[PDB]
Write a protein that binds this ligand. Structure first.
Ligand code: CU
Length: 105
């Protein structure tokens, strides 16, 4: 697979790891829609607004199956550790106009 999941469950914004690479979600958008990270980095999305959001990678992008992340409520977070270089597009399942990509270098 090309990413591992530290926590299957969302967790609190206060529990995000030190020196985490954070992408905020607010105003119905991923605030950093094109993020560039290195192989081995963990990206953490944090939902800053009341409307629930997730990240969803379709089948074949991070692995054989789709990775449909859990819905994050306000001030909840979710992390993925990327293990292989490439460009990985994602969207928000209930709000597919919200699109972003992670470029792992
Ligand atoms: Cu959303």
């Amino acid at each position: 697979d090309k990413a591992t999941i530290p926590s299957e469950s969302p967790f609190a914004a206060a529990e995000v790891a030190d020196g985490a690479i954070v992408v905020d979600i607010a105003k119905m958008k991923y605030e950093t829609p094109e993020l560039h990270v290195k192989v081995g980095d963990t990206v953490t999305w944090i939902n800053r607004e009341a409307m629930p959001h997730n990240v969803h990678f379709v089948a074949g992008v991070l692995g054989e199956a789709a990775l449909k992340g859990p819905m994050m409520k306000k001030e909840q977070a979710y992390s993925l550790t990327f293990t292989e270089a490439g460009t990985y597009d994602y969207h928000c399942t209930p709000h597919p106009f919200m699109r972003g990509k992670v470029v792992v270098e």
